[PDB]
Scaffold this motif. Structure first.
Motif, PDB file in Angstrom:
ATOM      1  N   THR A 232       0.822  -1.209   0.000  1.00  0.00           N
ATOM      2  CA  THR A 232       0.000   0.000   0.000  1.00  0.00           C
ATOM      3  C   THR A 232       0.859   1.263   0.000  1.00  0.00           C
ATOM      4  N   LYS A 233       0.180   2.417  -0.031  1.00  0.00           N
ATOM      5  CA  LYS A 233       0.813   3.701   0.273  1.00  0.00           C
ATOM      6  C   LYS A 233       0.331   4.291   1.594  1.00  0.00           C
ATOM      7  N   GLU A 234      -0.133   3.420   2.496  1.00  0.00           N
ATOM      8  CA  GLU A 234      -0.585   3.854   3.820  1.00  0.00           C
ATOM      9  C   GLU A 234       0.654   4.136   4.667  1.00  0.00           C
ATOM     10  N   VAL A 235       0.640   5.271   5.351  1.00  0.00           N
ATOM     11  CA  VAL A 235       1.798   5.706   6.145  1.00  0.00           C
ATOM     12  C   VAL A 235       2.098   4.714   7.274  1.00  0.00           C
ATOM     13  N   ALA A 236       3.364   4.316   7.364  1.00  0.00           N
ATOM     14  CA  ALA A 236       3.837   3.498   8.450  1.00  0.00           C
ATOM     15  C   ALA A 236       4.936   4.287   9.218  1.00  0.00           C
ATOM     16  N   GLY A 237       6.181   3.803   9.195  1.00  0.00           N
ATOM     17  CA  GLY A 237       7.312   4.425   9.889  1.00  0.00           C
ATOM     18  C   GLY A 237       8.072   5.408   9.042  1.00  0.00           C
ATOM     19  N   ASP A 238       9.367   5.546   9.333  1.00  0.00           N
ATOM     20  CA  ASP A 238      10.149   6.687   8.857  1.00  0.00           C
ATOM     21  C   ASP A 238      10.417   6.670   7.355  1.00  0.00           C
ATOM     22  N   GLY A 239      10.471   5.500   6.720  1.00  0.00           N
ATOM     23  CA  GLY A 239      10.580   5.469   5.270  1.00  0.00           C
ATOM     24  C   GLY A 239      11.874   6.027   4.680  1.00  0.00           C
ATOM     25  N   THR A 240      13.009   5.579   5.190  1.00  0.00           N
ATOM     26  CA  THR A 240      14.313   5.896   4.591  1.00  0.00           C
ATOM     27  C   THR A 240      14.819   4.685   3.813  1.00  0.00           C
ATOM     28  N   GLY A 241      15.404   4.884   2.623  1.00  0.00           N
ATOM     29  CA  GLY A 241      16.084   3.792   1.917  1.00  0.00           C
ATOM     30  C   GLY A 241      17.306   3.282   2.689  1.00  0.00           C
ATOM     31  N   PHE A 242      18.241   4.203   2.946  1.00  0.00           N
ATOM     32  CA  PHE A 242      19.500   3.927   3.601  1.00  0.00           C
ATOM     33  C   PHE A 242      19.770   4.999   4.653  1.00  0.00           C
ATOM     34  N   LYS A 243      19.605   4.643   5.926  1.00  0.00           N
ATOM     35  CA  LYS A 243      19.901   5.536   7.046  1.00  0.00           C
ATOM     36  C   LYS A 243      21.325   5.127   7.432  1.00  0.00           C
ATOM     37  N   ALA A 244      22.313   5.944   7.075  1.00  0.00           N
ATOM     38  CA  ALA A 244      23.719   5.501   6.997  1.00  0.00           C
ATOM     39  C   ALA A 244      24.622   6.077   8.094  1.00  0.00           C
ATOM     40  N   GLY A 245      24.037   6.368   9.255  1.00  0.00           N
ATOM     41  CA  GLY A 245      24.810   6.824  10.399  1.00  0.00           C
ATOM     42  C   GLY A 245      23.940   7.293  11.535  1.00  0.00           C
ATOM     43  N   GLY A 246      24.545   8.091  12.418  1.00  0.00           N
ATOM     44  CA  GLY A 246      23.852   8.686  13.551  1.00  0.00           C
ATOM     45  C   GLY A 246      24.075   7.996  14.880  1.00  0.00           C
TER      46      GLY A 246
END
Ligand SMILES: [Ca+2]
Length: 426
Positions: free
Chosen positions: A252-266
């Motif tokens: 679906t296109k129903e909103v879930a979580g943060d939706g990042t392809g590649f969260k590459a640090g932090g």
């Protein structure tokens, strides 16, 4: 060494031969030694609701279904392989395993010199209603020199692959998809990533936390992020991976979580206290990879405290396709963000045709090296620059050997390659 067999209709009273196969991995774990192989016959293995965990961790918080606790040797691994003489994939169905008040880990990996290939893990549960997680694979300090190949963690409520420690773990040609926690926190998908790299302070050091690589992997329709390297105290590399349609309820296109392809640090942005941080801020790498239609972001520095390498990637319609945001250094409170510093952002490609999407945000070109990217140039990238942008290509079945499918998705035409020379993942 020896070759053992398991089968959905086998028996743990059998000797584990081809004619008389075992029933479960619990029995396999009892007998294997360095150099042995288990051939896992195709079909569905439903783990019984009442099967006792092989171990627990974190003062009983975790129910660990299979404890991969034995080790091979260099050149003599222990191998757990889909049976190459029978067509089809083995499927471990975890949907009945619902221990009260516990997180679930399906494969808890403490051993070294292991090789796991060619099977699926489906239906892994979450039962805890507060903020929580489960994992299909959780790999920890001391688990070294392992290979996880052509494995598929999908249609469940658990993170696919989750690294808290270990060295030289190669996660190769794996898929994590359709993962969504419908139970915890009212069940809005929550916090389920495909692949997580989170090497902790306990596991730092050369040969202790170094050398872990995700390669040839795909992550799609995970509720949160495809790949997430937050709180990772040694460098992890993501190479030739595709991450698409994360941040949405599956299908679906129903909103879930943060939706990042590649969260590459932090290391987070907490207001109340400073996070633990490594003494060397690692240069994580995302190379030759593709982000498509993640809900919010493509390639994201995720508030890192130093430089990361984004080289030869392609982003299509993934919100903020590239977002280089770093946390202010030195580490301070209140936590604030700055345009990214010390990054290497080279040879990337970006297409935007989607409402709200953007090429590049939050980069400091005076403090990072940003060169030969399509978004740096005069000519805007357009649909006809590509051979194909048909998204179903990204979901094509892998080749029989486990390699990514051949696709034209995101590949420049011969003429466009001349105008965007050396740019993008293909
Ligand atoms: Ca995440």
């Amino acid at each position: 060494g020896k070759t053992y067999y398991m089968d959905p209709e086998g028996s743990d009273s059998n000797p584990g031969t081809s004619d008389k196969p075992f029933a479960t991995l619990v029995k396999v774990q009892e007998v294997v030694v360095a150099g042995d192989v288990v051939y896992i016959n195709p079909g569905t293995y439903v783990v019984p609701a009442n099967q006792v965990p092989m171990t627990t961790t974190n003062s009983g918080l975790y129910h660990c279904v299979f404890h991969m606790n034995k080790s091979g040797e260099a050149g003599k691994p222990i191998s757990y392989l889909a049976n190459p003489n029978k067509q089809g994939r083995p499927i471990f169905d975890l949907s009945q395993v619902k221990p009260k008040d516990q997180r679930i880990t399906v494969f808890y990996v403490t051993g070294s010199n292991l090789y796991l290939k060619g099977f699926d893990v489906i239906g892994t549960q979450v039962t805890i209603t507060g903020h929580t997680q489960s994992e299909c694979f959780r790999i920890v300090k001391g688990a070294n020199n392992n290979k996880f190949e052509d494995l598929r963690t999908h249609d469940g409520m658990a993170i696919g692959f989750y690294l808290l420690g270990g060295s030289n773990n190669h996660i190769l040609n794996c898929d994590a998809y359709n993962n969504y926690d419908s139970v915890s926190e009212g069940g809005k998908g929550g916090n389920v990533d495909g692949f997580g790299g989170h090497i902790n302070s306990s596991s730092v050091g050369e040969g202790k936390g170094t050398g872990n690589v995700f390669e040839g992997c795909r992550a799609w329709y995970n509720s949160d992020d495809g790949f997430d390297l937050i709180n990772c105290f040694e460098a992890v590399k993501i190479i030739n991976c595709w991450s698409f349609l994360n941040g949405y309820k599956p299908g679906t296109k129903e909103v879930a979580g943060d939706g990042t392809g590649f969260k590459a640090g932090g290391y987070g942005m907490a207001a109340d206290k400073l996070p633990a941080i490594p003494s060397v801020i690692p240069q994580h790498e995302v190379r030759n990879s593709l982000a498509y239609y993640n809900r919010l972001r493509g390639f994201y520095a995720n508030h890192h405290l130093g430089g990361i390498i984004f080289e030869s990637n392609t982003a299509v319609n993934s919100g903020e396709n590239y977002n280089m945001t770093n946390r202010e250094s030195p580490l301070a409170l209140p936590p604030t963000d700055v345009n990214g510093y010390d990054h290497m952002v080279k040879n990337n490609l970006s297409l935007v045709t989607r409402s709200g999407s953007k090429h590049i945000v939050m980069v400091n070109r005076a403090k990072s090296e940003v060169s030969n990217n399509s978004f740096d140039g005069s000519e805007e990238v357009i649909e006809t620059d590509f051979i194909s942008l048909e998204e179903a290509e990204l979901m094509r079945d892998r080749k029989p050997n486990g390699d990514l499918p051949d696709v034209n998705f995101g590949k420049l035409t011969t003429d466009a390659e001349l105008r965007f020379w050396g740019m993008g993942c293909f």
